[PDB]
Amino acid sequence: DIVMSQSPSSLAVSVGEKVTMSCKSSQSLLYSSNQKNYLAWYQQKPGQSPKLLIYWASTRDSGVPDRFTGSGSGTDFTLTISSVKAEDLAVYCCQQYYNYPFTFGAGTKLEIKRTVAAPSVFIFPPSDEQLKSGTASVVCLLNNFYPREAKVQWKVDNALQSGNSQESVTEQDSKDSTYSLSSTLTLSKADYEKHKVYACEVTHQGLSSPVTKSFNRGEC
């Protein structure tokens, strides 16, 4: 099966700048007879269905603005947005219809570039209402940061935590172009009362050194 490689997976762009996206196929897409490349480009916005932009590697679908351009031949293909608009933020994936099974690329996600913003860290001990139920959830909140790359590390009595925390990230804010992250450490009540100090350490580009928020269980 043909493998479609798209690099990079994510790209931070500025409104008005020229954007370029790469698509590489493991097998050649150029049919020798008609000298046509069986390559298509699609746009998919969050929650919506894919939308066709370019086919035959370079032919623009009807209605697609002229700022979208496809290029390349054989194995190397390229999608270019001459002057990116705000409404252009979406995932762009390539597709070969040259040989069954048809295969798609993983896509390139377009995001808005922004100056670095350090996160605001808040730690929340488990409520007393949940502790009666038999479980304890510690929540670490990382608020309004950029870029999205961020490392959250749970430390319980300085012991590193692994495999017992779930993470969640918001979509890029349409106003200040920042992200927000929420990490939840889940322990049983018996395990939660085994230790005292609970902390989440936050590593981010906007921080000179890792910022740590912590609390001691039972204290205020």
Partner 1 sequence: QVQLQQSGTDLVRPGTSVKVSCKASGYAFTTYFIEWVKQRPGQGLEWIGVINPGSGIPNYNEMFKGKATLTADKSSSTAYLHLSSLTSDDSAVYFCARAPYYYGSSYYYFDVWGAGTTVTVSSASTKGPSVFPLAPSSKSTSGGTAALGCLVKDYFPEPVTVSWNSGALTSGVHTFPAVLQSSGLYSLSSVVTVPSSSLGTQTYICNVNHKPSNTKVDKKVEPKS
Residues 31-50 contacting partner 1, CB under 8 A = 38, 40, 42, 49-50
Q: To the nearest whole angstrom, how small is the minimum distance from the Cβ of residue 153 to partner 1?
A: 17
Q: Closer to partner 1 at the Cβ: 177 or 182?
A: 182
Q: Does 220 bind partner 1 (CB under 8 A)?
A: yes
Q: How far is the CB of 67 from partner 1 (least distance, A)?
A: 20
Decide if residue 21 touches partner 1 (CB under 8 A).
no
Query: Is residue 97 at the binding interface for partner 1, with CB under 8 A as the rule?
Result: yes
83/166 with CB nearer partner 1? 166
Q: Does 180 bind partner 1 (CB under 8 A)?
A: yes
- Identified binder of partner 1 from the candidate list 25, 37, 103, 172, rule CB under 8 A: 103
Binding range to partner 1, per CB under 8 A, among 19-27, 78-86, 122-130, 154-162: 122-130
> What is the three-state SS of the chain?
CCCEEEECCEEEECCCCCEEEEEEECCCCECCCCCCECEEEEEECCCCCCEEEEECCCEECCCCCCCEEEEEECCEEEEEECCCCHHHCCEEEEEECCCCCCEEECCEEEEECCCCECCEEEEECCCHHHHCCCEEEEEEEEEEEECCCCEEEEEECCEECCCCEEEEECCCCCCCCCEEEEEEEEEEHHHHCCCCEEEEEEECCCCCCCEEEEEECCCC
Per CB under 8 A, residues contacting partner 1 are 38, 40, 42, 49-52, 55-56, 61, 93, 95, 97-107, 120-124, 126-127, 129-130, 133, 137, 139, 141, 143-144, 166-170, 180, 182, 184, 186, 213, 220
